[PDB]
Design a protein around this ligand. Structure first.
Ligand SMILES: [K+]
Ligand SMILES: [K+]
Ligand SMILES: [K+]
Ligand SMILES: [Zn+2]
Lengths: 177, 115, 60, 84
RNA sequence: CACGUGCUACAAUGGCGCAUACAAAGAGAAGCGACCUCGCGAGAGCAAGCGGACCUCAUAAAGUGCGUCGUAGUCCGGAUUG
């Protein structure tokens, strides 16, 4: 909510000036945030995937979608249709709340935090980052953590290029080294 | 509970619990506690959040955790880049302080590797 | 959102040592006390040789 | 390490050579047997050939090298590995 | 890399903290060096005494009392490295 309000009130104006956009619709928007956990160990134990899902649920506030192998892979000893991951797609209010929580609380709580790479744009203005420990998110309880699980966060943007994408995140003061 | 970006044990006495932080030993732990005015015997769980904050300020005075690790890494890297005797010993994974290598030196060399 | 499948998500008060207070929706439920936040974190704030050493130690 | 009160140790002959070389300009590498002599700031940018017991090993002094003995940069024993 | 002889451990019949008992034998003048002051400390400065049943090295430790740790790779261990 607050970050969404901030986007409209401040970010649009800053980006409009910076890129000399003709229209407000030209200004990049944060379409969605996807949180993914790749639980390879799930093949050995089904409960691990369930525990990972519960962690992703607590962080997201949203029940995760279980993902399954697209094709059989001998290397990873996985067969097609076997559940090997969980994902959540955050949009609208829930996305903005998560985005706020991540920047304000979770990112500071990262151990030895020295900023996030600004080279982690995919070339289309979309930013992906990895979280090594679920502990950083306050919702997770350190005492009750069975296993340390990381997750990968992707921010999908309407930005045409990385420069527009980095500018958008910079406008929100997303931490960058 | 959480100091220097890590979680200290609540059940342990403060003096022991602080040693969980990298860069803090028993001496520094006692000094931090003395400055904070917190008794060594007091458990971390018993300490109030305000008391924990005072501890956090004291810990901030000393280089610890990631900052210390960066300093240590740089010091070793410098030696290896220098190509000084010590640097060469670091490169080869052999003792750097003139210990014997004919026998022992297992900590540096690792488990015995059969010919 | 579907009903009955999602974690309970309610506004909670988050307090920090710096004194920044933030009210945010979360699954945590209970009020949170934070050691650090974006406001006070060193990186965000921006708070984050041999020749000199020789001269200082061995000044003649 | 040598006590601070005593100050850094350098062989007099090496010190004289370094001073002369600095005054003269860029010079051919200095040849010394004084492995025990500490590297000084004035030496920076000079090449000193330090005896390793059988040959003089050229060392180009750098800022990082300062405060180390010359012998540290010339290895006395040759080892290329067993069963190599 | 292989072997011999050791040292230190793997703990609670213990570790750590505080307080506090009880030896023998020996060495010393380019030497043993007190006291006092300074240093977290290793030491430093100053400076008695003693060629010694006199002075100095020089503190016995295990022990004992009390407290703490609570079976953990730990308040075990102390290698290794900066
Ligand atoms: K420690
Ligand atoms: K050796
Ligand atoms: K021995
Ligand atoms: Zn704060």
């Amino acid at each position: 909510a607050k970050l969404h309000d901030y986007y409209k009130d401040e970010v649009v104006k800053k980006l409009m000036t910076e890129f000399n956009y003709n229209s407000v619709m030209q200004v990049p928007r944060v379409e969605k945030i996807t949180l993914n956990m790749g639980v390879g160990e799930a093949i050995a134990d089904k409960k691990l995937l369930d525990n990972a899902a519960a962690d992703l649920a607590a962080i997201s506030g949203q029940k995760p979608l279980i993902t399954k192998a697209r094709k059989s892979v001998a290397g990873f000893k996985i067969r097609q249709g076997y559940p090997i991951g969980c994902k959540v797609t955050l949009r609208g209010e829930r996305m903005w709340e998560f985005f706020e929580r991540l920047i304000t609380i979770a990112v500071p709580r990262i151990r030895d935090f020295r900023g996030l790479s600004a080279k982690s744009f995919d070339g289309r203005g979309n930013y992906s980052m990895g979280v090594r420990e679920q502990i950083i998110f306050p919702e997770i309880d350190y005492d009750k953590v069975d296993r340390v699980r990381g997750l990968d966060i992707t921010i999908t943007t309407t930005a045409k290029s990385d420069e527009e994408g980095r500018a958008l995140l910079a406008a929100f003061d997303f931490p960058f080294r | 509970a959480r100091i220097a970006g890590i979680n200290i044990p609540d059940h342990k006495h403060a003096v022991i619990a602080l040693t969980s932080i990298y860069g803090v030993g028993k001496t520094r732990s006692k000094a931090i506690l003395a400055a904070a005015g917190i008794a060594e015997d007091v458990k971390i769980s018993e300490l109030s959040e305000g008391q924990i904050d005072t501890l956090r300020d004291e810990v901030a005075k000393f280089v610890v955790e990631g900052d210390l690790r960066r300093e240590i890494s740089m010091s070793i890297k410098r030696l290896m880049d220098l190509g000084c005797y010590r640097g060469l010993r670091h490169r080869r994974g052999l003792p750097v302080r003139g210990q014997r290598t004919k026998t022992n030196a297992r900590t540096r060399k690792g488990p015995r590797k059969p010919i | 959102m579907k009903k009955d499948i999602h974690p309970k998500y309610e506004e909670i008060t988050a307090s920090c040592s710096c004194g920044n207070v933030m009210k945010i929706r979360s699954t945590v439920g209970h009020d949170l006390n934070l050691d650090v936040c974006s406001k006070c974190h060193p990186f965000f704030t921006g708070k984050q040789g041999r020749v000199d050493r020789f001269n200082k130690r061995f000044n003649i | 390490p040598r006590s601070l009160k005593k100050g850094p140790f350098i062989d007099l002959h090496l010190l004289k050579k370094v001073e002369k070389a600095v005054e003269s300009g860029d010079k051919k590498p200095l040849r010394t047997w004084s492995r025990r002599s500490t590297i000084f700031p004035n030496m920076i940018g000079l090449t000193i050939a330090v005896h390793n017991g059988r040959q003089h090993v050229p060392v180009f002094v750098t800022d990082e090298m300062v405060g180390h003995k010359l012998g540290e940069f010339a290895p006395t024993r040759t080892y290329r590995g067993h069963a190599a």
